[PDB]
Amino acid sequence: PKSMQCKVILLDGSEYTCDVEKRSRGQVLFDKVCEHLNLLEKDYFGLTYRDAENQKNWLDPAKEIKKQVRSGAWHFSFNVKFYPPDPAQLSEDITRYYLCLQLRDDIVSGRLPCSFVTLALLGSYTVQSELGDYDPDECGSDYISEFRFAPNHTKELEDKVIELHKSHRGMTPAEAEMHFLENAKKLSMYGVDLHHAKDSEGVEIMLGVCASGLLIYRDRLRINRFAWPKVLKISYKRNNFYIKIRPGEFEQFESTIGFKLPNHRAAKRLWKVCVEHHTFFRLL
Ligand SMILES: O=S1(=O)CCCN1Cc1cccc(F)c1
Ligand SMILES: O=S1(=O)CCCN1Cc1cccc(F)c1
């Protein structure tokens, strides 16, 4: 039975190596990574790979790894797939921990925009979680933390992290991670997966997919929002993604909004992530 070497980038930035039989489904590899991570609350997470166009794709746990990676390397990342709107309701601290690591990368990367003050507050909770109580010994007036807190670091930001860290004395890692999550979860791009698209008139928009529904970002002024309840159906055909919207009471016919994606594969990817978010953040 022939086995392929898999390389997984973990959220702490380290590499996990393992082998699976070459006809393995994605679930086999995912189960191995989650066991390595001592992670029980697995439903929020998934593995990504990069396709031949270099786009991030979710590894479907139900299908053969080889029919997804196709010609590419068996190289993956471990990621948050479904960002819980209320992280306080996760049953385990270790779940909250991996969620924090994913959000730190979301912030540093600029996928999750954040005010100065929220960058410093989030950074201060990470420091408290990782170093414990503020100590002046590892911090003179010139201190710069090894921790990456932001897409662009400034001395003013480093100073503010230290000022807020002083205030967290006696806070345990689990408590600091919970505070990190209570702040992060309120940010307007928390858990939003953005896709480049054109509207029916060819104007460049972004479609966001999250727990609460679909977002159309036409610009900072005029942002269309479709709670899942309002979304009747979604479809893709060629390079097109269409969404059907419920009529309001005593209106006769659903409305159709169509979008143009860059190519057929981008349309299909958007459709699948929407179906999966609808299925997950339907239930309750
Ligand atoms: O994701 S969580 O916040 C973490 C545990 C409780 N959560 C479930 C949830 C949230 C929103 C809608 C729904 F059907 C189920
Ligand atoms: O529309 S479907 O592709 C039909 C089969 C799966 N779909 C689920 C769905 C229903 C409603 C909203 C939504 F985003 C996804």
Curated annotation (Swiss-Prot):
It comes from the Eukaryota. The gene is EPB41L3. Interacts (via FERM domain) with CADM1. Interacts (via FERM domain) with PRMT3; the interaction is direct and inhibits the protein-arginine N-methyltransferase activity of PRMT3. Interacts with PRMT5. Interacts with PRMT6. It is found in: Cytoplasm, Cytoskeleton; Cell junction; Cell membrane; Cytoplasm. The chain holds residues 107 to 390 of 1087 of the full protein. It comes from Homo sapiens. Expressed at high levels in brain, with lower levels in kidney, intestine, and testis. Detected in lung. Tumor suppressor that inhibits cell proliferation and promotes apoptosis. Modulates the activity of protein arginine N-methyltransferases, including PRMT3 and PRMT5. Residues 4-284 form the FERM domain. This is Band 4.1-like protein 3.
